Design a binder for this molecule. Structure first.
Ligand SMILES: CCn1c2ccc(OC(C)C)cc2c2cc(C(=O)NCc3ccc(S(=O)(=O)CC)cc3)ccc21
Length: 259
């Protein structure tokens, strides 16, 4: 590429991210005073393990849906082959969400936006996966300290998705070319903005992997306890990405072709 082509890539990635923002950053910020009452938090903790999982899995899926749209509007993604498009989303959708999640996290009070209001990590006690939950909270605390801008979120999440070491890619070099061009864009924007210093403070990719593996390990435990809840009440797309052998659902392909 070239300088103008790189800056055009910066604007195109940032646009594609805004359009597929689930919630505008301002909407999330204006709600920061709206905090679950102690009584409301007690009600969350007393809900059954399997209903909490169903509600959270459904919210997770909604977020995942916006990440698919981001991909479809992202330069070069839709020129990749369908096998590679699915490998990328299958492995990176949960990662993009975990990163996007820091916009919904308030480090002042350590709360996360969820079902209309902000609550701390006790809100999630009914799930029986406190390690996962505190890892995600801590992970969102780390990212919140860097004070990402929205533009920086878009460029960074683009790279989280366009990761050419995902196993199973058929056109690895084509994904390499794309990844390298988004890296230059990201780094060009940080340099231009005097923000290269965040580069040494980004999470190792091994960390995003770790959280996703914890996600799936805890899903398998829950599914073994409530197999019929998963079969009858989890979102199909969620089963496709995360459960086993749940990928008999072909939702992603449907999503990727539907205009
Ligand atoms: C660690 C605590 N936590 C969860 C823990 C587990 C879990 O699912 C498992 C049960 C499978 C799901 C959640 C979960 C979901 C939300 C959520 O969706 N809030 C609504 C929202 C809407 C838009 C944005 S955004 O615009 O910033 C783009 C992402 C952010 C947030 C918040 C916290 C959560």
């Amino acid at each position: 590429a070239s300088l103008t082509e790189i800056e055009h890539l910066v604007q195109s990635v940032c646009k594609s991210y805004r359009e597929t923002c689930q919630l505008r950053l301002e909407d999330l910020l204006r709600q920061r005073s709206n905090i679950f009452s102690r009584e409301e938090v007690t009600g969350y903790q007393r809900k059954s393990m399997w209903e909490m999982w169903e509600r959270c899995a459904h919210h997770l899926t909604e977020a995942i849906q916006y990440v698919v749209e981001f991909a479809k509007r992202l330069s070069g993604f839709m020129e990749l082959c369908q096998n590679d498009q699915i490998v990328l989303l299958k492995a990176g959708a949960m990662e993009v969400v975990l990163v996007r999640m820091c916009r919904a996290y308030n480090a002042d009070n350590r709360t996360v936006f969820f079902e209309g209001k902000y609550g701390g990590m006790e809100l999630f006690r009914a799930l029986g996966c406190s390690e996962l939950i505190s890892s995600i909270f801590d992970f969102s605390h780390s990212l919140s300290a860097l004070h990402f801008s929205e533009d920086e979120i878009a460029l960074y999440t683009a790279l989280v998705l366009i990761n050419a070491h995902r196993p199973g890619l058929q056109e690895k070099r084509k994904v390499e070319q794309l990844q390298y061009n988004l890296e230059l864009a990201f780094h060009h924007h940080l340099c231009k903005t005097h923000r290269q210093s965040i580069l040494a403070k980004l999470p190792p990719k091994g960390k995003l992997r770790s959280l996703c593996s914890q996600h799936v390990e805890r899903l398998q435990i829950f599914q073994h306890l409530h197999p019929i809840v998963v079969q009858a009440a989890f979102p199909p797309l969620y089963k496709e990405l995360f459960s086993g052998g749940g990928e008999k659902h072909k939702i992603l392909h449907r999503l990727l072709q539907d205009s």
